[PDB]
Amino acid sequence: FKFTAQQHVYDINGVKVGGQPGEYPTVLIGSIFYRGHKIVSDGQKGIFDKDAAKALLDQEAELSAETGNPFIIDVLGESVEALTKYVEFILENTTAPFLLDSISPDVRVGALKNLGKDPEIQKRLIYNSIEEHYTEEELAAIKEAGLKTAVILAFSKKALKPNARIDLLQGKDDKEGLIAAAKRAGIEQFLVDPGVLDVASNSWTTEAINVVKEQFGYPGGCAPSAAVYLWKKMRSKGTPFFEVAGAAVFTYPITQGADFILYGPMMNAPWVYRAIATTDAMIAYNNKLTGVKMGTTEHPLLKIF
Amino acid sequence: FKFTAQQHVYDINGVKVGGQPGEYPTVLIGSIFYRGHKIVSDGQKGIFDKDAAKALLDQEAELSAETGNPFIIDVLGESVEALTKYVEFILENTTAPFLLDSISPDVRVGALKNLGKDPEIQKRLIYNSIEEHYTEEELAAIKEAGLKTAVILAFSKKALKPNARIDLLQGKDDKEGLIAAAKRAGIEQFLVDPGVLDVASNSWTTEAINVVKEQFGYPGGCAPSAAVYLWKKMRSKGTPFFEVAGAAVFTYPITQGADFILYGPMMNAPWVYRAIATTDAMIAYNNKLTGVKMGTTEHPLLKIF
């Protein structure tokens, strides 16, 4: 299958994201300094294991080189002080782009203030996320930082149908669309995450990704990790049950033409990369029938066999 | 996914197979007495550990009850003596349908000859397979047995592309094709397996399954286990890398609307059931969008969470 709209392929400090199915490998986004991460001893001050963080980053580079799946780091923080330190460390200890990420918007806003309108921040920092309840101070913070790429969380807990993403992105009635809001903050590149409620509803998330790519061509992806970790029945079964079950959830959106996955904790990268790379290789082999051409030689199809 | 043709749903001794995606759970087909299966002490005579074989069968029943994925047993033999004894054991020690399976047509034919005319054989035994080298003797033997269900195997290194596998199935030029051959043997129910050449080309297998369901409405599935076991680079990595990779391969045809998977050795059932059930739950959650109704309450979506 192929999408009608010409697909946006963004180049985020070397990382290609988007395209027609089989054109580009899945971009894999691993979480670090998340709530309960054992390498963080104090989430308020940002006291973290630099050796263990470096080792996770080096492992991501090695898996990325093995499969050809590019990586963006999901950097989480619970305070301005902590997320600022986390971001400074990520900037120095990898070349990867990264998500500035937090549960609390005020943590993202505060961290942007500290980081300033640094040209490296504009090239490597992706705002996570512009959500339905965005504030003017949030858009001002993004604009002062001079950011160019954001995750658009195209999720409304009152608008669960895939077709409603057209309304959320474009706007409807008196409501400014999320794309219009991002553009006001100076954002030019939109990674669309339609949101995941639970594991089963990942099928609606992936259908929403298809609508967005079909009609607008923005790269589409999602973040099923929270839904997988709340599946206590699977998680307590141990190896390899939790891993294959996770693999089934994380690969599913890719089988329907999604462009990126937030796969959760980076410690799971070794099995996530191998499953995702397997799905990419099979999708790209289908190119041979569709005439769709790979946009890079760094593709799992040419690497993992 | 929703398929053009009206789908054929077979009821094989209580096991539902086929339909629109999300209508019925994936049927999982585990292999027993395969080459090198260590519970077999003599593969020529069919001497095996009956308690160990019973333990695999009981485990399949337990996993099936957990997820709601029905099971058919893939019963392999390398001799008429062995496959006859294997079939007699499976008849008495499970209620499940099974594949009468051998690489050697002579072994399949010989074993079928031993089993005679038996309504239990006609209801439970699925011939594996009607394939490109079929003989009139083999069709006559199937007709004498009064079998009604067969695996139609389009695996041929003279039919690599999906549309060439459809030509093998429906017939072309001087060939009646595999479906026409099965019908002359009195087969009325066709489980179509386009074959797996290698891991990457599981997408071509899946494209062939899609054409079958689009045009004919016959249940479609495949047997990717050999291709996964021959993947030295991935298998070398061990647990859980081999399994998540295997799960990516086995779930992929299900994400594109396939009806059944031969997942290889029954010992792998514990992780195969957990991955496949996960994909099924996500597919069934789509049912409102596709306009599909579940045909049963025994569905992973209603059981595994």
UniProtKB/TrEMBL annotation, chains A, B:
<protein>
    <submittedName>
        <fullName>Tetrahydromethanopterin S-methyltransferase</fullName>
        <ecNumber>2.1.1.86</ecNumber>
    </submittedName>
</protein>
<dbReference type="Pfam" id="PF02007">
    <property type="entry name" value="MtrH"/>
</dbReference>
<keyword id="KW-0808">Transferase</keyword>
<comment type="similarity">
    <text>Belongs to the MtrH family.</text>
</comment>
<dbReference type="GO" id="GO:0008168">
    <property type="term" value="F:methyltransferase activity"/>
</dbReference>
<dbReference type="GO" id="GO:0006730">
    <property type="term" value="P:one-carbon metabolic process"/>
</dbReference>
<dbReference type="InterPro" id="IPR011005">
    <property type="entry name" value="Dihydropteroate_synth-like_sf"/>
</dbReference>
<dbReference type="GO" id="GO:0032259">
    <property type="term" value="P:methylation"/>
</dbReference>
<keyword id="KW-0489">Methyltransferase</keyword>
<dbReference type="InterPro" id="IPR023467">
    <property type="entry name" value="MeTrfase_MtrH/MtxH"/>
</dbReference>
